[PDB]
Amino acid sequence: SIFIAAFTARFLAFLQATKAQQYVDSYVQESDLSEVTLPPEIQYFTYARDKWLPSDPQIISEGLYAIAVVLSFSRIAYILPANESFGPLQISL
């Protein structure tokens, strides 16, 4: 559920970003987007990591993703019983 929560936030960020991408090509016509003064909502997605909101879906995604990777290696507990040397070692743990 943490892993799903990591990618659900990631997928949500994809929908909004391509929405702003669909806006720029549709209405504002220029060779370079930098010289354009975009609408404040559309111009938000042109910002870097510095200007991102604290509760951005991508930030929610990255933290949940890292937690999942920490828990992912906890699945070795399903395999260590078979090993003879590491078998009883796990039981005491």
Ligand X SMILES: CCCCCCCC/C=C\CCCCCCCC(=O)O[C@@H](COC(=O)CCCCCCCCCCCCCCC)COP(=O)([O-])OCC[N+](C)(C)C
Binding site for ligand X (CB under 6 A): 1-2, 5, 54-55, 60, 64, 67
Distance CA 20, CA 41 (A): 8
Residue 26 or 55 with smaller CB distance to ligand X: 55
Output 33 or 76, the one with its CB closest to ligand X: 76
Binding of residue 48 to its own copies (CB under 8 A): no
Query: Look-up: residue for tokens 């010289």?
Result: 35
SS3 17: helix
Q: Which is nearer to its own copies, 26 or 85 (CB)?
A: 85
Q: How far is the CB of 25 from ligand X (least distance, A)?
A: 32
Residue 72 CA to residue 83 CA, distance in Å, equals 20
The H or E element spanning position 63 is helix 57-72
Output the six-digit token pair for 92. Answer: 């005491």
Which residues contact its own copies (rule: CB under 8 A)?
A: 49-50, 52, 54-55, 59-60, 62-67, 69-70, 72-74, 76, 84-86, 89-90, 92-93
